[PDB]
Amino acid sequence: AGILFEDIFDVKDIDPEGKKFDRVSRLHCESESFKMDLILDVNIQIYPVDLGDKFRLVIASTLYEDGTLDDGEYNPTDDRPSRADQFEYVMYGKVYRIEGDETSTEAATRLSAYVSYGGLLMRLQGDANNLHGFEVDSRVYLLMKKLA
């Protein structure tokens, strides 16, 4: 299957630095479980969001719950089962940076992964143990569903 990360997050700010793009907003979110800071640019036009919304977030390698890849090829006719059917807002991108608070003599405790989804940026900071599933220059799927 492969789920590189999973949690539930709560929104705390929509555009704390002001509005810059009138269809996408830079949501700031926090995990009530692990304290992973999240700063994700989400299309608000197609998927409206509000302050204080709770939502399950999953960061996965594939979508087919079998470890089967598709090399980033669009394929609307694939009849295989889809994890993305369990979610509302489904994005695809590539992790492009993994920094940390490591020293020159000891490993990192906190890691910060920066990911791009066609320009829409996801900064996920948090504990290294949760984020060790991330590998730079790897394709990735974001899957979000609000929790009423």
Binding site: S104, T105, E106, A107, E135, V136, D137
Partner: protein
Amino acid sequence: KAFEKKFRFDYTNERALRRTLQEDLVKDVLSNAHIQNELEREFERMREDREVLRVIFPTGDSKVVLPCNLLRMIWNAQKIFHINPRLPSDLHPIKVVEGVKELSKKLVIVNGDDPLSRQAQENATLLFNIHLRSTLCSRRMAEEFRLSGEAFDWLLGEIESKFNQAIAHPGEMVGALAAQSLGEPATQMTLNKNVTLGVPRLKELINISKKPKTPSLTVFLLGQSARDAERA
């Protein structure tokens, strides 16, 4: 202090080598002092190059022009070979030093082997070799670039090929080329204590005038007057 911090490769602190290098290479470098001496020679000659650049560039400006971009080529090697800098690498520092020396031999501007020819060969590629040694010191190679051995060999070959392609081809009419490339900016020039500028100033330069329009001296002081307005 910062020069030593960023460019002196420390073989004394084991923990950095554990973090950055595979254990076999760490035991190799820590065991025998010969490789340690080689790295110290590298740092010594880089320090000498630093003093040389202080003589050459007293303005303290790092922007220069050179035949090849080494940082982006390192980046291309990283992405071609999918190098993950979050891992301890395998690159032997002495291999880096040896490869840099061999590539320095391979890049030739002045052919022939004699004292005058070798001196001219040193002088021609002096600045580029200094830049290459500063960039491709084993310190930064094993610390931040984290490049692999095969990728490093590819990088050396690519730098060799691109430098050899950058040589000025014989038969080129650099005269007319310089003339046209210097005449073109004159077409867009605003006509301006004050000093004359623009194409009248350019004409006064090239058409050497026994009477300049604004013959001026740029005088500098060195006593207290260098700091003191009153004595100035």
